[PDB]
Design a protein around this ligand. Sequence first.
Ligand SMILES: *[C@@H]1O[C@H](CO)[C@@H](O[C@@H]2O[C@H](CO)[C@@H](O[C@@H]3O[C@H](CO[C@H]4O[C@H](CO)[C@@H](O)[C@H](O)[C@@H]4O)[C@@H](O)[C@H](O[C@H]4O[C@H](CO)[C@@H](O)[C@H](O)[C@@H]4O[C@H]4O[C@H](CO)[C@@H](O)[C@H](O)[C@@H]4O)[C@@H]3O)[C@H](O)[C@H]2NC(C)=O)[C@H](O)[C@H]1NC(C)=O
Ligand SMILES: *[C@@H]1O[C@H](CO)[C@@H](O[C@@H]2O[C@H](CO)[C@@H](O)[C@H](O)[C@H]2NC(C)=O)[C@H](O)[C@H]1NC(C)=O
Ligand SMILES: *[C@@H]1O[C@H](CO)[C@@H](O)[C@H](O)[C@H]1NC(C)=O
Ligand SMILES: *[C@@H]1O[C@H](CO)[C@@H](O)[C@H](O)[C@H]1NC(C)=O
Ligand SMILES: [Ca+2]
Ligand SMILES: [Ca+2]
Ligand SMILES: [Ca+2]
Ligand SMILES: [Ca+2]
Ligand SMILES: [Ca+2]
Ligand SMILES: [Mg+2]
Lengths: 444, 75
Amino acid sequence: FNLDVDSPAEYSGPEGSYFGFAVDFFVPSASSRMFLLVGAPKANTTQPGIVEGGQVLKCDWSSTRRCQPIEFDATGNRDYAKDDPLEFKSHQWFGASVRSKQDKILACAPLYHWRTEMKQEREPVGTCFLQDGTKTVEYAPCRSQDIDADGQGFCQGGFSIDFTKADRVLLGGPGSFYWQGQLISDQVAEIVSKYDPNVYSIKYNNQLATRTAQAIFDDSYLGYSVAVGDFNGDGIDDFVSGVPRAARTLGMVYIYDGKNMSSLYNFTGEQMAAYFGFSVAATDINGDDYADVFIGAPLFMDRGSDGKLQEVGQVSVSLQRASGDFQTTKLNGFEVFARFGSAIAPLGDLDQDGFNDIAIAAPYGGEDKKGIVYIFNGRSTGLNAVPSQILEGQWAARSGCPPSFGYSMKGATDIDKNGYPDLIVGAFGVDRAILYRARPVITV
Amino acid sequence: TKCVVRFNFRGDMAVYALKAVKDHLKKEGPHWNITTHNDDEVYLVVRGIHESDAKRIAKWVESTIPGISVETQCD
Ligand SMILES: *[C@@H]1O[C@H](CO)[C@@H](O[C@@H]2O[C@H](CO)[C@@H](O[C@@H]3O[C@H](CO[C@H]4O[C@H](CO)[C@@H](O)[C@H](O)[C@@H]4O)[C@@H](O)[C@H](O[C@H]4O[C@H](CO)[C@@H](O)[C@H](O)[C@@H]4O[C@H]4O[C@H](CO)[C@@H](O)[C@H](O)[C@@H]4O)[C@@H]3O)[C@H](O)[C@H]2NC(C)=O)[C@H](O)[C@H]1NC(C)=O
Ligand SMILES: *[C@@H]1O[C@H](CO)[C@@H](O[C@@H]2O[C@H](CO)[C@@H](O)[C@H](O)[C@H]2NC(C)=O)[C@H](O)[C@H]1NC(C)=O
Ligand SMILES: *[C@@H]1O[C@H](CO)[C@@H](O)[C@H](O)[C@H]1NC(C)=O
Ligand SMILES: *[C@@H]1O[C@H](CO)[C@@H](O)[C@H](O)[C@H]1NC(C)=O
Ligand SMILES: [Ca+2]
Ligand SMILES: [Ca+2]
Ligand SMILES: [Ca+2]
Ligand SMILES: [Ca+2]
Ligand SMILES: [Ca+2]
Ligand SMILES: [Mg+2]
């Protein structure tokens, strides 16, 4: 209810670049100033022969509003042999997935392809660039000797990423092992230290990962979307992973132990093709010190009293109890074909009432399918099913694709330094990104 | 001596890959115990492969048919 939607900070990129596809905040531990990170996966770079390589832009905030590219990669395609390219950066979608912790920026390119040494091919392995301090290294955990569809060749590593409070990188690669999906977790120190630009396949010592399973798990896309939080009381963030096409396309969410990857919990959807697990989030929504799990299901159809089914979207909210048990309730969308629940973004305690709040988007709702973001407040009994605030998209589609306001969101970072965390919302269909700041809340 | 090698075929081309591998194995080992299954999960198993032959066929597959998961178990 306290977001300022009257005077928001609006940023834009080159037309056709999908600027605003993915957003995050950049907050160095002691720079005094903060930047917004806005991806533009189809942007035209200055690289020697790269078309629509994609880029990540570091957007300022105080004073004026300008965006500039980060030179994570200032070169083109390296050769393997004379007239035989090693890698293909054109149309790699760099900036499609971006996350940052302190001065560490992890920017990924899920459609990056390369040949491997064993044979000449073009496999969508996916790579990430990790920048910290004054050094940049390439992180590519799916770029290895285990190649092609049965291996990590089609991993698309970096599709979904996050950070663990233990200074570990959590990376989801939904295409591994014929799309069973894989989670990979490693240490920042290992990633930065064990770096050699002449080595394409790098092994790390403290890496954890999931493994290939039976064909009955094929095309499940595990690691489609990831999140972290403590689900066993060991003080170590565990791993939450959406698996949207699992269990006869009911969709599932898996929780793995953050120290040794042993499986801890399993959530299963109710309706086929609701695509349950599209997006997940882990946060304490009721003040119990136990992380709770939020699972989106954007294609869910809500059957009415006459038997008619309306596609509205659904979000499942489960509270963690000390026993390890979960208490689950359901929240349905409000508009037909708006796809409510496609994007879930914890805001932290948006209104400073002691309970965390969460934003849930419905990117194709509202007038002319501009897109709507719903703000839901928390409480001691779990999430309040009635939204407190409605954020509407402000732009018309220019070339078929809806602005898709609310497609990608990030909160829980306070940029204007007032104690109330702000929210950045992408609208890539019109190459825009908009920052909504949270107002102080006065109780009388 | 003797080992067991299993090939797991997945994807839209699983049956084409199965045929390509099966035909290769039949030519390399006309009298190998080659068993195939096309029920739900598609796979090929060769039993009694003469140990070194397990690596010889795995290498051929890796360099030819794109992505077949091969498991070798030797005593
Ligand atoms: C949340 O939900 C997930 C699934 O959605 C669940 O994970 C799955 O757990 C099962 C185990 O319950 C995994 O299935 C197998 O587990 C065995 C471990 O041993 C148990 O099962 C055997 C069965 O005979 C018992 O004898 C034994 O006592 C135990 O009970 C593994 O050994 C299996 O490994 C296979 O792959 C290996 C790869 O190297 C092979 O070497 C091995 O031989 C197995 O191959 C199988 O398939 C082959 C196909 O050709 C076949 O030829 C072989 O003969 C054999 O049948 C295997 O892992 C299952 O994989 C897990 N799936 C996923 C996605 O993780 C979580 O546990 C659950 N979590 C919670 C909290 O509920
Ligand atoms: C990036 O540059 C490419 C090449 O200049 C642009 O692609 C061209 O777009 C025009 C639009 O009228 C087409 O007629 C050409 O045929 C396209 N060429 C190729 C090779 O695709 C692309 O649109 C630019 N993208 C961005 C975001 O600026
Ligand atoms: C992971 O660590 C926990 C610690 O309590 C232990 O109980 C569990 O058995 C371990 N699992 C594996 C696979 O090592
Ligand atoms: C509609 O008709 C059914 C009987 O088929 C009845 O039980 C129901 O109460 C009616 N609903 C309304 C709103 O009249
Ligand atoms: Ca833990
Ligand atoms: Ca809780
Ligand atoms: Ca609150
Ligand atoms: Ca603020
Ligand atoms: Ca297909
Ligand atoms: Mg087919």
